[PDB]
Design a binder for these strands. Structure first.
Length: 116
RNA sequence: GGGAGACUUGAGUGCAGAAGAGGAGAGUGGAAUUCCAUGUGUAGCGGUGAAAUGCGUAGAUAUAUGGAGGAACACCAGUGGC
């Protein structure tokens, strides 16, 4: 009901950006996404949409009561820095930022190339 | 070319060293994917040139802790080696 420290996950792909604010233990608190802000198609991938999604999610998280957050950037999307700055501006104290883009150690075979 | 010898340079052995993803067998490690279980959580997620099919309120995606199992071995890595 009331929290002080939490985590903000920024999953930004080539299509859409999702921002998920949880407690420091990962229990979800609030989340938003360019798709949930009405953006569609290519617009969802734009840095601006990442900014807006971060903004809305920060509002709800702070409304729940939350000051400091640590950010995890995932995916090769473009809106990462826009989302980070949106969090700061909306008020949350970005304590730390880490890149968690999964990197298979070879592992599973990726899908084929396009247009072949 | 044949026959009887001689020789050590080719060829091989001995002796002393060097490198290596060479092969075969038995084990074994971590990342990641998927699935399964359980929390949180809510309306999207995913995808394209643009869309739709599809998955999702029977609670999805995300997210956290685990579990299962399979395949391939990131960085090293290099007209590098064998």
């Amino acid at each position: 009901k009331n929290i002080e420290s939490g985590v903000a996950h920024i999953h930004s792909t080539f299509n859409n950006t999702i921002v998920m604010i949880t407690d420091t233990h990962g229990n979800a608190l609030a989340w938003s996404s360019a798709g949930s802000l009405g953006f569609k198609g290519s617009k969802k991938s734009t840095p601006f949409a990442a900014q807006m999604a971060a903004e809305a999610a920060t509002k709800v998280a702070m409304e729940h009561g939350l000051k400091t957050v640590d950010v995890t950037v995932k995916g090769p999307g473009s809106g990462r820095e826009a989302a980070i700055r949106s969090l700061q501006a909306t008020g949350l104290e970005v304590t730390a930022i880490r890149d968690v883009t999964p990197v298979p150690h070879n592992g599973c075979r990726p899908p084929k190339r396009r247009r072949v």
